[PDB]
């Protein structure tokens, strides 16, 4: 506690509602971006198809498989497959999954992502577990099957980021508001009569103070205080998103510093 | 054609949700309104991802081989 | 987004918004009226005529057709056949000069006139790229 | 079909550098550093903070074209004080603010329930 | 394993040779589809 000042008011396993005090807007922002965009994760990224007698085409399922939430908790200790010295993949860069199910009954047989199965060695790290929030206990819903239709796949989950494909995003929807009344007049509100009767008072209007008619416009003021909230898909628990956010922002700030050091050389 | 995973616009997973939706309307008798809300679907891009999707798969299944 | 254009969310696309499947059908037959000249399906090569297509034939098996699993693009021959004239002139059909994708189904039948007759299908997924009319 | 592979967003190509630094001809004591494989998430921060430093006269950035992942930052400073330093002090000043946030958040998060 | 064709309506693992033309086996319909390959195809998962 010496600068930037957080304070949570509501927090769950997928919601961190907090004020963020004492900061440059330009930062708060760059935080939310790098959140959405640049925090590493694991998600299926190569499907080898054995047999597929589904009403759904190959490349379709492949795509669907992409999006499935897979555990990335320990992810920051798995290697980028572009980096790893193996030809294609290994357990040092990738988790491999298997899916088969097969029409068995008359009644429509579902293929949940609970029917997903690790194959490769996790070497005891916490990775590649299809994530289920479902009460009933069934992750997502891949596909469906009539009486006699196999489906034989082989998922190779690889490290990656949102900037490459929104499957690798961990984040979902990020709430973001500053200065609930327009004290900074950063906006000019549209209207037909009363600006106030016509727009709505943001829930964030109790933790700030009303303006008081008499006062003239405060000018040299700037942006403190940003009323945020972080939802999570849940490859990563909410806290680690924001943490790793602050982290990756720092890491890629940090690498410029290194790059300037590398150029005094020649 | 199979409930999409994750709404195009927000990101939040919406696959795991189709089933429960069906149930909360036609079983213990609610209106699609309150039902969309029990599921935790507040933001309406991710509200429209379910209320609109049409489950055609049900119909290709029908075709025999 | 100026003069009747629009900017779209790259993100939402990867997430699936506005994707299509594009199946296309090619089609073929064996001559018809002939008592000394009849067409034939086979993965050809030389044999006196040497008028063969620019592309790769190797995607074909023995019956003259591609298998379903296989990926195709460029001038990939997709159905080969010979018109033996007095020995065997080529008449096979390349996948479109601009196209690319995965074989889906392959139909093998006869026509009323006893004809050997074929219908190879090809599939792409076409993702909403930049200038596509909306 | 003409589309340019995703990773060309964060991966460097060949013979390219994470920075190239070049001297502005217009002014004195002024420079324009290029930033390969970057964008706003980074430039907008560098800049705004490079503006809390009172020995800096000028500081601006611009994504020349959203097709490519570049972004050019141009800085001008007081007599003496080489720009690199400017860029340096600010680069750091941010890490420190960030580090604090990390810990400050880490403190609160621990106090809550659920 | 070594299969060449399949008729459309029921799904019989037929595999007859040239100088046989067409037709199923106790199901008739001269339709027929070409099975699949075993070069088991790789997918961009995007
Ligand atoms: Zn490897
Ligand atoms: Zn949404
Ligand atoms: Zn039959």
Curated annotation (Swiss-Prot), chain B:
Signal peptide positions on this chain: none
Query: Which UniProt keywords are present, listed alphabetically?
Result: DNA-directed RNA polymerase, Isopeptide bond, Metal-binding, Nucleus, Ribosome biogenesis, Transcription, Ubl conjugation, Zinc
Can you tell me which residues bind Zn(2+)? 7, 10, 45-46
What terms describe the molecular function in GO for this protein? DNA binding; DNA-directed RNA polymerase activity; zinc ion binding
> For this UniProt entry, what's an example GO CC term?
RNA polymerase II, core complex
**GO biological process per UniProt:** nucleolar large rRNA transcription by RNA polymerase I; ribosome biogenesis; RNA-templated transcription; termination of RNA polymerase I transcription; termination of RNA polymerase III transcription; transcription by RNA polymerase I; transcription by RNA polymerase II; transcription by RNA polymerase III
Glycyl lysine isopeptide (Lys-Gly) (interchain with G-Cter in ubiquitin) crosslink location in chain: 59
What Pfam families does UniProt report for this protein, alphabetically?
RNA_pol_N
Which HAMAP family does its entry note? RNApol_arch_Rpo10 (MF_00250)
Q: How does it assemble?
A: Component of the RNA polymerase I (Pol I), RNA polymerase II (Pol II) and RNA polymerase III (Pol III) complexes. Component of the RNA polymerase I (Pol I) complex consisting of 14 subunits: RPA135, RPA190, RPC40, RPA14, RPB5, RPO26, RPA43, RPB8, RPA12, RPB10, RPC19, RPC10, RPA49 and RPA34. The complex is composed of a horseshoe-shaped core containing ten subunits (RPA135, RPA190, RPB5, RPO26, RPB8, RPB10, RPC10, RPA12, RPC19 and RPC40) where RPA135 and RPA190 form the DNA-binding cleft.
Which family does the similarity line name? Belongs to the archaeal Rpo10/eukaryotic RPB10 RNA polymerase subunit family.
Cite any additional comment in the entry.
Present with 5300 molecules/cell in log phase SD medium.
UniProtKB/Swiss-Prot annotation, chain C:
Disulfide cysteine pairs (residue numbers): none
- Lineage, top-rank taxon, reads Eukaryota
Signal peptide positions on this chain: none
UniProt: Mg(2+) binding residues: 4
Compartment(s) = Nucleus
Q: List-wise, which residues carry Phosphoserine?
A: 86
**Remaining remarks:** The binding of ribonucleoside triphosphate to the RNA polymerase II transcribing complex probably involves a two-step mechanism. The initial binding seems to occur at the entry (E) site and involves a magnesium ion coordinated by three conserved aspartate residues of the two largest RNA Pol II subunits. Present with 18700 molecules/cell in log phase SD medium.
By sequence similarity, the record places it as follows: Belongs to the RNA polymerase beta chain family.
Quaternary form? Component of the RNA polymerase II (Pol II) complex consisting of 12 subunits.
What is this protein's function? Answer: DNA-dependent RNA polymerase catalyzes the transcription of DNA into RNA using the four ribonucleoside triphosphates as substrates. Second largest component of RNA polymerases II which synthesizes mRNA precursors and many functional non-coding RNAs. Proposed to contribute to the polymerase catalytic activity and forms the polymerase active center together with the largest subunit. Pol II is the central component of the basal RNA polymerase II transcription machinery.
Q: What is this protein called?
A: DNA-directed RNA polymerase II subunit RPB2
Q: Which organism is it from?
A: Saccharomyces cerevisiae (strain ATCC 204508 / S288c) (Baker's yeast)
Q: Which lineage?
A: Eukaryota, Fungi, Dikarya, Ascomycota, Saccharomycotina
Q: Which residues of the full protein are shown?
A: 834 to 980 of 1224
UniProtKB/Swiss-Prot annotation, chain D:
Write the gene name.
RPB11
**Keyword Nucleus included in the entry's annotation:** yes
User: Anything else of interest in the record?
Assistant: Present with 4280 molecules/cell in log phase SD medium.
What does the annotation give as the result of altering residue 111 to P?
Answer: Transcript termination readthrough
Q: Which InterPro entries match?
A: RBP11, RBP11-like, RBP11-like_dimer, RNA_pol_Rpb11_13-16kDa_CS, Rpo11-like
Q: What is this protein called?
A: DNA-directed RNA polymerase II subunit RPB11
Q: Which GO terms describe its biological process?
A: RNA-templated transcription; termination of RNA polymerase II transcription; transcription by RNA polymerase II; transcription elongation by RNA polymerase II; transcription initiation at RNA polymerase II promoter
Query: Which UniProt keywords are given for this protein, alphabetically ordered?
Result: DNA-directed RNA polymerase, Nucleus, Transcription
**One Pfam entry name:** RNA_pol_L_2
Q: Write down any Gene Ontology CC term.
A: RNA polymerase II, core complex
CDD domains of this UniProt entry?
RNAP_II_RPB11
Does Acyltransferase appear among the keywords? no
Q: What is the lineage of its organism?
A: Eukaryota, Fungi, Dikarya, Ascomycota, Saccharomycotina
What binding partners and quaternary form does the record give? Component of the RNA polymerase II (Pol II) complex consisting of 12 subunits.
Swiss-Prot record, chain E:
Q: Which residues bind Zn(2+)?
A: 7, 10, 24, 27
| Gene Ontology cellular component terms for the protein in this record | cytoplasm; nucleolus; nucleoplasm; nucleus; peroxisome; RNA polymerase I complex; RNA polymerase II, core complex; RNA polymerase III complex
User: Which of UniProt's keywords are assigned here?
Assistant: DNA-directed RNA polymerase, Metal-binding, Nucleus, Peroxisome, Ribosome biogenesis, Transcription, Zinc, Zinc-finger
Q: How is it modified after translation?
A: The N-terminus is blocked.
Zn-finger (C4-type) residues: 7-27
Q: Which GO terms describe its molecular function?
A: DNA binding; DNA-directed RNA polymerase activity; zinc ion binding
Q: Which GO terms describe its biological process?
A: nucleolar large rRNA transcription by RNA polymerase I; ribosome biogenesis; RNA-templated transcription; termination of RNA polymerase I transcription; termination of RNA polymerase III transcription; transcription by RNA polymerase I; transcription by RNA polymerase II; transcription by RNA polymerase III
Give its localization: Nucleus, Nucleolus; Peroxisome
As for family, the record states: Belongs to the archaeal Rpo12/eukaryotic RPC10 RNA polymerase subunit family.
The record makes one more remark, namely: Present with 907 molecules/cell in log phase SD medium.
State what protein this is by name. Answer: DNA-directed RNA polymerases I, II, and III subunit RPABC4
Q: Give the source species.
A: Saccharomyces cerevisiae (strain ATCC 204508 / S288c) (Baker's yeast)
Name of the coding gene: RPC10
Q: Which residues of the full protein are shown?
A: 25 to 70 of 70
